[PDB]
């Protein structure tokens, strides 16, 4: 097992380009976070690029779309950003952006030629992880995942990932999603159903995705109220199914139960024997299970990610 990095082509994610003199205030009014912006050119022109995490919320304060924002270098009157969204919502996100671009000097275009890749360390110790990007060069747009270091690097490229990453092999996309679920990282519309998922229950603050010191944005009121009312009472947690599973798997929405039969949450989504569940943030320790169709149990275990604060 000789490759130090696994390189995954994320066909479920895609890029939109948002550019124009008004691109920043335009996006800031629609997202939960500040936008990524690198320090200005200093004594030359090295590749200073940053990523940020945010959600687009609806007016009820529910998450619509989870996005990663990338700062484009424009060096001129026009701001520019790449927005990475779930491929299945690209069109709905475009219509959502258009609703708000009346009297805004901004254009929104798909950038289908640049593909989204993820680069995960094969071993968590990651000697040499520190030097990967300087050790990859300016050919590779390789940026630390803004949600957590546990998610490795985003690589935006037209090329093949391993051709740019020293020690990198192509990975099986199954293993990328397995890693997400083991680490408790939600991504995309199954984990975050548009208009149903709630951002702070989806651990947005733990993932560097919300600012409580920014100006107005859609959904800000509910989100701020929830944050300031006290500890969040339900969150998405990683779960592991302990016994061999049905052939269909587990139905999204299935009730998670204590040994007493008390409801403590609902299964959200997963792959294989791992997934996420929306649970009360108390009482994730007790023995938990879901009821199969006979009522026969599927056991499961919930845990607390090690990168959470």
Curated annotation (Swiss-Prot):
Keywords: Acetylation, Disease variant, Heme biosynthesis, Hereditary spastic paraplegia, Mitochondrion, Neurodegeneration, Primary mitochondrial disease, Transit peptide. It comes from the Eukaryota. Changing residue 216 to A: Abolishes the formation of the [2Fe-2S] ISCA2-IBA57 complex formation. It is found in: Mitochondrion. InterPro entries: TrmE/GcvT_dom1, YgfZ/GcvT, YgfZ/GcvT_CS. It holds the Pfam family Beta-barrel_CAF17_C. It is linked to Multiple mitochondrial dysfunctions syndrome 3: A severe disorder of systemic energy metabolism, resulting in weakness, respiratory failure, lack of neurologic development, lactic acidosis, hyperglycinemia and early death. Some patients show failure to thrive, pulmonary hypertension, hypotonia and irritability. Biochemical features include severe combined deficiency of the 2-oxoacid dehydrogenases, defective lipoic acid synthesis and reduction in activity of mitochondrial respiratory chain complexes. This is Iron-sulfur cluster assembly factor IBA57, mitochondrial. It comes from Homo sapiens (Human).
């Amino acid at each position: 097992a000789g490759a130090a990095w696994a390189c995954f082509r994320l066909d479920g994610r895609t890029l939109l380009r948002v550019r124009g003199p008004d691109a920043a205030p335009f996006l800031l009014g629609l997202l939960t976070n500040e936008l990524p912006l690198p320090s200005p050119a200093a004594a030359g022109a090295p590749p200073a690029a940053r990523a940020g995490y945010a959600h687009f919320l609806n007016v009820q304060g529910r998450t619509l779309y989870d996005v990663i924002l990338y700062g484009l270098q424009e060096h001129s009157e026009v701001s520019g950003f790449l927005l990475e969204c779930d491929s299945s919502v690209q069109g709905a996100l475009q219509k959502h952006l258009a609703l708000y671009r009346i009297r805004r000097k901004v254009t929104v275009e798909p950038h289908p030629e640049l593909r989204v890749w993820a680069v995960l360390p094969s071993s968590p110790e990651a000697c040499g992880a520190a030097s990967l990007q300087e050790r990859a060069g300016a050919a590779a747009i390789l940026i630390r995942d803004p949600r957590t270091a546990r998610m490795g690097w985003r690589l935006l490229t037209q090329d093949e990932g391993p051709a740019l990453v020293p020690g990198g092999r192509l990975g099986d996309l199954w293993d990328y999603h397995q890693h997400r679920y083991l680490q408790g990282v939600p991504e995309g519309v199954r984990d975050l159903p548009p208009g149903v998922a709630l951002p702070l229950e989806s651990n947005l603050a733990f993932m560097n995705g919300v600012s409580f010191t920014k100006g107005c944005y859609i959904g800000q009121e509910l989100t701020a109220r929830t944050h300031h009312m006290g500890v969040i009472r339900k969150r998405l947690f990683p779960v592991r199914f302990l016994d061999p599973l049905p052939t269909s798997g587990i139905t999204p929405g299935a009730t998670v139960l204590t040994a007493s039969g008390q409801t403590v949450g609902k299964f959200r989504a997963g792959q294989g024997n791992v997934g996420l569940a929306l649970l009360w943030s108390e009482k994730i320790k007790g023995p938990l299970h879901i009821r199969a169709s006979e009522g026969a149990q599927v056991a499961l275990a919930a845990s607390v990610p090690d990168w959470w604060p």
